[PDB]
């Protein structure tokens, strides 16, 4: 009766931050209740721990109030059979909302909307009579979003908030032998939502596991581990504090044993009863053991040395009541003298922020996915990850512990959408709610070695609540530093200056919360903390420009210990078309309102875990070996702090314009922080013209746990020499004929013919034989289909006049009209010479001026020479080159320049100069939100079909015009055009990326010279 919906729902606990839970057990590290020490030791599975994951019955309602009392007693006819865990939006019930800042619901704390999507889950299951004789049977939900009430066998059990941490209830007295039934009612919105405003899809449900754990009556209630070291780490102390619940009987003992493999390293036994703590005594229900470990193997992301710790609760006669365990990693984390140290050396964090996202499963995580992510990261030169912005699925820590990644664990607290940001975090009334989001995280994850820093949440301004919570942590677990960026990045609530999007060299001095240039921030008066960016280098779409600038500061300034790139995966979701064809969806694609569109796609990898090209630029910049070339000696520097180059080979090689002349291989013997000298054999040197390039690669000959054999971990290339070509071509056998007309000029020579339209001034067509080559005339191009960064936050509604695109738009770039100023043909001794001039103007303003000369010679080669003039007072153009639509469509593209991957000017350090050959398909980058892409810089020669262009340029080539790109919201809607679109740039502006909501292109990468010159040679084979 008092179990009635009617009664229960009445209190509206989900509209009250003063009730965060009802009848929930305390937090603690992961338990299994093994009843045999070996299983515990070997991490075998505990029969005392049962999963309730699977098929559950579910029914959706628009408001908690629309639930029928019946539900409590019996299933529902119309209840569907759903799989758990899952996100009900993933099943169709309601839509997922992709909003960033702006809260999904209306801001009226602590109220929530009356229309509040309720999901009723139910499960019928069996409890074995043995579980009811003794012990305690409790239930666990690893993640319920956002809040929920619970009934068992028609009785009300409890309530819980906090989507990202476990809620546990003792079912001990509601359970009946055999058949039991659970009724779980999950509310989408609650007062907890006010604290969960992270930039991500807004979903709901029982999205993490459900389990049953059977514990003895007298049991281990919690335990913590700690490791102290001596000056040189040659000796450690493992300290374990154990607490128990139940009746304390003198025959009770505890044994803590430390294994390393099969080998027991240390063991300790004792009975309950701690040291005197105060005037009343000590804890009789606790015991602390201390094990001495000589020459412990240390844990690090470089070498994840782990031990196993077993905690046995037994009686003195040797009888085991129960056992728990955890992996142990010996490491010390400290900030000392402005530096963050790990095991005494200073880290350089090569990290990334990662959300729990699956395109198919929404926010439900699985082992496979976790592992994939981990390996990609490790393969790509990452050390660390930040749990943006809440505690993750438990297994995560374990994997990191094991594979080796540093983890920053973060409280599930984000109130980004309040005004001001502080509003709740400065309010004592939210102190409790917040408090639980921090404390429980710590109680749960504190024993993992991978966790090296605690974070108070994200973007919730800076309030007195943070200060308190930060102090709490420091008191409770001084083993790790605390960080929080809110309120300016350097408040009293953080041990590290941890801004987001601070530029390297430029300051952004917003009122109250400026973002100084990182190099400058450190030397502000009185400042002494280390600086590590919590988010930097916004990887949204065609991005990552300038990435290297960061890497370089990091390397030059000690107190700049790296940062976390934003972010790992694109938060795109899968949708299906008219023919059961899938496609990547984003903000607002689910009729979701209000929404932030593409803003959910900032990953380095696509939702399927396939990489964006940016990923390489990272990989290379973050590489652990560094090179310098001096004469014919290569100096190698190791950035490893703990390990020796012991699975590393260096391959070297010399080549002249793509042609290999020499190769070597040399095994690296460099210690962490060491140098290795490498002298090369006498290097060949040819008479032939061209550039000679040295390229080196570090290879991992043997496979590791996260890499295959032959994995390349680093590389670098240098230009060694140049033999300039002092050779004049063979005087043409033939001579081209010029046929004039009033419409055009024709040039014929051989089967070849070229036509220039005298009215437009462009080369309108060309034939090889009877076949035409163009579909579109060759013409000047000064624009580009806007990248995400060019656009920023500019919308049709709300225009951002500062966004590059807006400027360009406003100035007429996109709609300027050419103007023939001149077009002449002249006959040279051995060639024809065409000469043109256009002016591009908009509203009587001449933006640019293009002046060319085409010169066709007996060789049947045309040489284009171009010279642009850009008005000082017009926004600098995105680019400067030509384009045209070719008639042909070939299978491959071959070029001699940077590649193989897409590379832009402020994003090309990872690319190598060489001869690349790839399929056309590979020259297009499927950024879900179409834009200019696929560029390759420093090209010297490009070959497509019978064409060959030569010079110094950047280019791109696909089946999509710039216009089509520019006009398609999703990549799935693009259609291949008639032939091949070719864009050949003499120059291209950088892509930026410091952030994606303000101009981020550094000046060095802006086409601001005024005068631009370039030349080409088009010809055939």
């Amino acid at each position, epitope marked *: 009766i008092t179990d009635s919906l009617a009664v229960v729902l009445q209190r509206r606990d989900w509209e009250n931050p003063g009730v965060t839970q009802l009848n929930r057990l305390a937090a603690h590290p992961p338990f299994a209740s093994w009843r045999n020490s070996e299983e515990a030791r070997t*991490d*075998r*599975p505990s029969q005392q721990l049962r*999963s309730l*994951n*699977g*098929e559950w019955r579910f029914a959706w309602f628009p408001a908690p109030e629309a639930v029928p009392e019946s539900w409590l007693e019996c299933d529902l006819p119309e209840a569907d*059979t759903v799989v758990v865990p899952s996100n009900w939006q*993933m099943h169709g019930y309601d839509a997922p909302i992709y909003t960033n800042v702006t809260y999904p619901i209306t801001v009226n704390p602590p109220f929530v909307p009356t229309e509040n999507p309720t999901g009723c889950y139910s499960l019928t299951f069996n409890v074995d009579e043995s579980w009811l004789q003794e012990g305690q049977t409790r239930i666990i939900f690893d993640g319920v979003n956002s809040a929920f009430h619970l009934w068992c066998n028609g009785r009300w059990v409890g309530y819980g908030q906090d989507s990202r941490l476990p809620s546990e209830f003792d079912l001990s007295a509601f359970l009946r032998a055999g058949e039991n039934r659970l009724a779980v009612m999950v509310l989408r919105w609650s007062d907890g939502s006010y604290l969960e405003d992270q930039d991500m899809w807004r979903m709901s449900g029982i999205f993490r596991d459900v389990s049953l754990l059977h514990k003895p009556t007298t049991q281990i209630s919690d335990f913590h581990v700690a490791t102290r070291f001596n000056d040189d780490f040659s000796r450690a102390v493992l300290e374990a504090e154990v607490q128990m619940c139940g009746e304390l009987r003198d025959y009770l003992r505890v044994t803590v044993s430390l294994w390393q493999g099969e080998t027991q390293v240390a063991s300790g036994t004792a009975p309950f009863g701690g040291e005197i703590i105060d005037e009343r005594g000590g804890y009789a229900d606790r015991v602390t053991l201390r094990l001495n470990v000589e020459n412990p193997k240390l844990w690090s992301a470089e070498i994840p040395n782990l031990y196993r710790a077993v905690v046995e609760l037994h009686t003195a006669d040797g009888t085991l009541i129960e056992a728990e365990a955890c992996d142990v990693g010996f490491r010390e984390v400290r900030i000392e003298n402005g530096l963050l140290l790990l095991n005494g050396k200073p880290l350089l964090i090569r990290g990334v922020n990662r959300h729990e996202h699956h*395109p*198919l499963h929404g926010q439900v995580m699985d*082992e*496979q996915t976790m*592992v994939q992510d981990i390996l990609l990261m490790k393969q790509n030169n990452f050390n660390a990850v930040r749990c943006s912005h809440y505690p993750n699925h438990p297994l995560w820590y374990t994997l990191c512990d094991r594979y080796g990644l540093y983890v920053v664990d973060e409280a599930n607290i984000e109130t980004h959408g309040m005004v001001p940001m502080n509003r709740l975090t400065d309010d004592p009334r939210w102190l409790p709610a917040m408090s639980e989001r921090v404390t429980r995280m710590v109680q749960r994850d504190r024993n993992h070695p991978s966790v090296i820093i605690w974070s108070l949440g994200n973007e919730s301004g800076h309030g007195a609540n943070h200060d308190a919570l930060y102090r709490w942590i420091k008191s409770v677990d001084p083993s790790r530093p605390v960080q929080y960026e809110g309120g300016g990045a350097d408040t009293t609530a953080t041990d590290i200056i941890c801004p987001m999007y601070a530029r390297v060299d430029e300051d952004q001095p917003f009122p109250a919360v400026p973002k100084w240039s990182i190099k400058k921030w450190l030397s502000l008066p009185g400042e002494t903390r280390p600086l590590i960016l919590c988010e930097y280098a916004h990887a949204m779409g065609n991005s990552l420009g300038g990435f290297a600038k960061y890497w370089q500061a990091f390397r030059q300034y000690p107190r700049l210990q790296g940062g976390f790139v934003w972010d790992w995966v694109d938060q795109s979701l*899968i*949708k*299906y*078309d*008219e*023919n*059961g*064809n*899938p*496609w*990547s969806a984003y903000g607002g694609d689910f009729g979701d309102t209000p929404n932030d569109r593409q803003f959910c796609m900032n990953g380095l990898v*696509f*939702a*399927d*875990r*396939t990489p964006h090209p940016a990923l390489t630029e990272a990989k290379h910049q973050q590489q652990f070996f560094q090179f310098r070339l001096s004469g014919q000696t290569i100096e190698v520097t190791s950035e490893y702090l703990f390990r020796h180059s012991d699975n590393e080979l260096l391959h070297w090689m010399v080549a002249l314009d793509g042609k290999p002349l020499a190769s070597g291989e040399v095994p690296l013997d460099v210690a962490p922080q060491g140098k290795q000298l490498i002298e090369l054999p006498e290097l060949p040197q040819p008479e032939s013209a061209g550039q000679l390039w040295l390229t080196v690669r570090v290879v991992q000959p043997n*496979a590791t*746990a996260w890499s*295959e054999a032959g994995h390349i971990s680093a590389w670098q290339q240098w230009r060694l020499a140049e033999n300039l070509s002092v050779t004049l071509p063979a005087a043409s056998h033939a001579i081209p004929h010029l046929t004039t007309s009033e419409m055009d000029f024709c040039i014929e020579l051989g089967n070849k013919r070229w036509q220039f339209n005298r009215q437009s001034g462009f080369l309108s067509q060309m034939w090889i034989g009877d076949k035409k080559q163009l579909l579109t005339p060759l013409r000047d191009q000064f624009t580009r289909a806007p990248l995400d960064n060019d656009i920023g936050v500019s919308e049709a509604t709300r225009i951002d006049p500062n966004a590059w695109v807006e400027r360009w738009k406003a100035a007429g770039h996109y709609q300027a009209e050419a103007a023939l100023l001149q077009c002449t043909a002249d006959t040279l001794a051995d060639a024809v010479l065409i000469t043109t001039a256009h002016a591009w103007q908009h509203q009587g303003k001449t933006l640019f001026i293009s002046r060319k000369t085409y010169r066709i010679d007996g060789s049947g080669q045309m040489a284009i020479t171009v010279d642009v003039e850009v008005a000082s007072d017009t926004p600098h153009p995105a680019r400067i080159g030509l384009n045209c639509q070719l008639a042909q469509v070939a299978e491959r593209v071959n070029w001699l320049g940077l590649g193989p991957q897409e590379n832009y000017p402020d994003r090309l350090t990872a690319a190598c100069f060489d001869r690349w050959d790839l399929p056309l398909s590979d020259m297009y980058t*499927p950024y879900v939100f179409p834009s200019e892409n696929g560029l390759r810089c420093g090209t010297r020669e490009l070959n497509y079909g019978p064409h060959q262009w030569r010079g110094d340029f950047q280019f791109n080539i696909s089946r999509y015009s710039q216009q089509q790109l520019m006009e398609t919201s999703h990549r799935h809607l693009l259609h291949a055009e008639e032939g091949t679109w070719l864009n050949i740039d003499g120059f291209h502006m950088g892509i930026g990326g410091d952030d994606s909501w303000s101009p981020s292109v550094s000046a060095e990468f802006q086409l601001s010279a005024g005068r631009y010159h370039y030349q080409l040679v088009w010809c055939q084979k």
Partner: antibody
Amino acid sequence: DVQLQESGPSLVKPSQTLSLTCSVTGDSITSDYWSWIRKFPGNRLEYMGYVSYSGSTYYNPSLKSRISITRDTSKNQYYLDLNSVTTEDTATYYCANWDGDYWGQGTLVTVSA
Amino acid sequence: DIVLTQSPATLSVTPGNSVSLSCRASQSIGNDLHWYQQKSHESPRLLIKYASQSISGIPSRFSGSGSGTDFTLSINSVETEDFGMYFCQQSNSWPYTFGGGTKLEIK
């Protein structure tokens, strides 16, 4: 609930292209990763490949570029195309989701002159 | 590629008795080892995933253990419906590969 079913020719000639269709009912093809697995007459199983949500494909190197896996959301089906088949391609072909929870009934395809 | 070797190739047992099947990887695959059952004229059925994780709808008598290179599938008190083929499959690295299989028969 979800159901998968293979369809297509049971007998093909050497050198031709073997093409099978996997019809998915109960849920959208955009809601999972899809695979093709085959069992050779001698009880040997081979994972041919799979297509994930982004459209990226993964093919077994043993298939020497003869394989193509595609999708059609409008028909809620995905396909397997194996070119230049030989007697070595005689096997029972199955479609299943990446998780391995849902499998088709399997269809025998014999390659004979 | 990763090679999975299963042993024994064939195992005969009398219903009621328990058995354990072995699967070893040529190199470490962490916990990415799954177990499948396959009967004549039928598609494979997933029994255990990621070395030891249980699957809804599978008899409780099936359990998995192991990590790295050595894994085991155990059947506590074999039933007649258990006779057939058992294959392990790794998903740690592409291409995914299957073991050669172990045939479980009545003795």
